[PDB]
Design a protein around this ligand. Sequence first.
Ligand SMILES: [Mg+2]
Ligand SMILES: [Mg+2]
Ligand SMILES: [Mg+2]
Ligand SMILES: [Mg+2]
Ligand SMILES: [Mg+2]
Ligand SMILES: [Mg+2]
Ligand SMILES: [Mg+2]
Ligand SMILES: [Mg+2]
Ligand SMILES: [Mg+2]
Ligand SMILES: [Mg+2]
Ligand SMILES: [Mg+2]
Ligand SMILES: [Mg+2]
Ligand SMILES: [Mg+2]
Ligand SMILES: [Mg+2]
Ligand SMILES: [Mg+2]
Ligand SMILES: [Mg+2]
Ligand SMILES: [Mg+2]
Ligand SMILES: [Mg+2]
Ligand SMILES: [Mg+2]
Lengths: 210, 40, 133, 95
Amino acid sequence: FTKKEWYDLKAPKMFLVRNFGKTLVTKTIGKKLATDSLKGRIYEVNLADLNNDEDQAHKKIKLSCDHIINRDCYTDFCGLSITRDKLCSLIRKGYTLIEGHTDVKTLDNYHLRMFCIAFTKKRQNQTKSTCYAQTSQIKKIRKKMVDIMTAEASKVLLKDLVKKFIPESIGKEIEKQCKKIYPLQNVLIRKVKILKRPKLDISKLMELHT
Amino acid sequence: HPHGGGNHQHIGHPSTVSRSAPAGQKVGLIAARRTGLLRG
Amino acid sequence: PQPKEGELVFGVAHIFASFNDTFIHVTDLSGRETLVRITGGMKVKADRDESSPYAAMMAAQDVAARLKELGVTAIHIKLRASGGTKSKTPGPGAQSALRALARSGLKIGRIEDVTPIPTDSTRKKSGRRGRRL
Amino acid sequence: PKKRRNGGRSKHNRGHVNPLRCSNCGRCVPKDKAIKRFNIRNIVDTSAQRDIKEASVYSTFQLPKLYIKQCYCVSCAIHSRFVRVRSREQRRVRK
RNA sequence: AUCCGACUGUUUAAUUAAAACAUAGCAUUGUGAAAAGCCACAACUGGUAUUAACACAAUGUGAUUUCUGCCCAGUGCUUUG
RNA sequence: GGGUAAUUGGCGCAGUUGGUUAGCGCGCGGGUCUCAUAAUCCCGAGGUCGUGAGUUCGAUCCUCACAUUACCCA
RNA sequence: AGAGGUGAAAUUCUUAGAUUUUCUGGAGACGAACAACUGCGAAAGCAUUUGUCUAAAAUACUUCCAUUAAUCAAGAACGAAAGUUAAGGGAGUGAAGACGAUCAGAUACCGUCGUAAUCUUAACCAUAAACUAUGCCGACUAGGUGUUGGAUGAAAGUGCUUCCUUCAGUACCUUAUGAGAAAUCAAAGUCUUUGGGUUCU
Ligand SMILES: [Mg+2]
Ligand SMILES: [Mg+2]
Ligand SMILES: [Mg+2]
Ligand SMILES: [Mg+2]
Ligand SMILES: [Mg+2]
Ligand SMILES: [Mg+2]
Ligand SMILES: [Mg+2]
Ligand SMILES: [Mg+2]
Ligand SMILES: [Mg+2]
Ligand SMILES: [Mg+2]
Ligand SMILES: [Mg+2]
Ligand SMILES: [Mg+2]
Ligand SMILES: [Mg+2]
Ligand SMILES: [Mg+2]
Ligand SMILES: [Mg+2]
Ligand SMILES: [Mg+2]
Ligand SMILES: [Mg+2]
Ligand SMILES: [Mg+2]
Ligand SMILES: [Mg+2]
């Protein structure tokens, strides 16, 4: 029955809003602490409402709370997704799609999968119905995607990687080095799954919220 | 034996006994959850 | 709760329409801590009409009343179409539920389709030669 | 008397083709014989579409579409009138 | 040519040597351990055990071939709180 | 012999909440529209296991049946 | 406080919390969209990523040998699904079987359950509308539009794309003083103007 309390959710300062809603919970009773029920929850937000710009209306973002001061949860980063309708709008008949995945470790000892996706282009002066590519070219392109993901992700750091996700630098870079094999259309990082986390350290976490 | 005797060689008794039966009596299928052919 | 001035409070409404019933389930924005569930089949008694637009409209009205009672003033929409190895299109009640929710008086946040498509395909019921009518 | 030159399907230089299942009635049909339809639908009709518009935040909202890609068997397809019965000369007319 | 038992094997010392018992093959049941399964002792302690699921213990049927249908209302055994 | 539960309309069930003491689905008879079936809305009837209270009731010992578990010196 | 399921309903699950939403771990099958009158293989067949092993074409060649070839009774290798033997595995689907419905009857079509089987390893079986219902090798005979893989020659590029030839594979359209009983056929034509070689019926 409803004798509950409301809390405030706060995003890390990598984004622009930093107040994206509230949540309920039952008041604590004997040996039910009302704070073990809060921590570990996962929240999915669109990133258009986290940054206030409608061009980024795809790319849902997942957030998990780890620390609780008196009435606030602090909700650091967990993963990505791509909003199914956007993915469905990209697949037309007369082309070919390339796709690959990899495992990588950051400097903080996180582990991730990345799942890129790509499609071929026209090079318009061709005047032919289709734009198919041979298998060997697909193999070369996939190898390039895996190498570029590995370098970029294993290079720097977690929060810097997250800042890299927002403007989609990996896609531009992959597209640029794959031009000599075959022209490619819109290239995306389709999904990022967090695989292992080193250890909770609330000093760092609260340094993310200044 | 509990099975012994008779004019036709049968048991005459349910052959599944309980876990608490005494030593001279626990003789058939002990504390059987189930009997018959297994099908999975 | 204790909202600030002119600030909206959000929740998530999971809609399920399945050619036999219509679920309207509202939770907070984490998934846990459900708030209302009126599911359509509590509004008629014919054992059919559970998927009719009428029952969905009645259920949506009940949900809006309870949600205003609690203090929630906005809703995110997730739409489902019962799509495992079963049908992929939503049933006749989804449109009526959405329209009743829109005309209730709440504010509508966002709409998304979350039907569980498989890349996998365990085998489908009613083996070859199909369901013969 | 061989009413169709291709035998009702488009298969050449192959032995076997894997089947799929009818979206309506569940029957197995080879993929090269089933009729395919691709749909781009709206979630709601236009009146409800405009009703959602002024119930919305963001002042510039567009409803999403639905992508389906259904497939049917001959019996379950021409009972619904996606395909009809034509004359001897009109049968040969593709496109 | 028919009946029984598949076969080598065993049995009522002193009235019954068999179609009776055993047997390979088949199936069912319990148990992950020194606070376990099955059994001995008045107690203290032991057997399996110099063991460990391809193991130990408790029962049915009885080589091969071809098969092994329906019934959980009754009586047993068993699972949940 | 002891303990618990239940008995209300043609059937199945709610009322045991004393200054209102009786209710609902299947029923039953008339319009509604039903390519000959169908969600159908108005109504009329239908009664509390049995005898007595510092009381206006379903509050008291007992007595008839039914079910469950348990008990036993003429 | 109902859920499933149907033309409508039963059988079935659920206040001992069903259906529904979120997270965590395990298990076994499957490989959507892309995906085509497209590719490979003697046929049966073959579709997630990476590595190793192993063959096969086509194209280019002023490389080597020099008739080493075509088709083949007997004989040999492979051969879908179902089915049989043994050990695993056992989610979904589900011959048998049990119910609930419909019906004059319903051992059916519809629905709720559900055994074998379906999957892997090691052995059998040798059959399908195993179909292009068209054996294999060679020559000749007509125009066009595509497409898959090489090579040659030429233009727009910001050592790459378009165009022109030619070889190999694969479809379609039009037409036949060519053929058929016709449907139709680029072979099912070059057949009373009847004989290029060869196996099976
Ligand atoms: Mg490639
Ligand atoms: Mg006997
Ligand atoms: Mg008897
Ligand atoms: Mg029909
Ligand atoms: Mg075939
Ligand atoms: Mg003998
Ligand atoms: Mg025998
Ligand atoms: Mg002897
Ligand atoms: Mg003697
Ligand atoms: Mg003697
Ligand atoms: Mg014997
Ligand atoms: Mg034996
Ligand atoms: Mg019984
Ligand atoms: Mg398992
Ligand atoms: Mg199973
Ligand atoms: Mg089933
Ligand atoms: Mg044959
Ligand atoms: Mg033939
Ligand atoms: Mg002649």
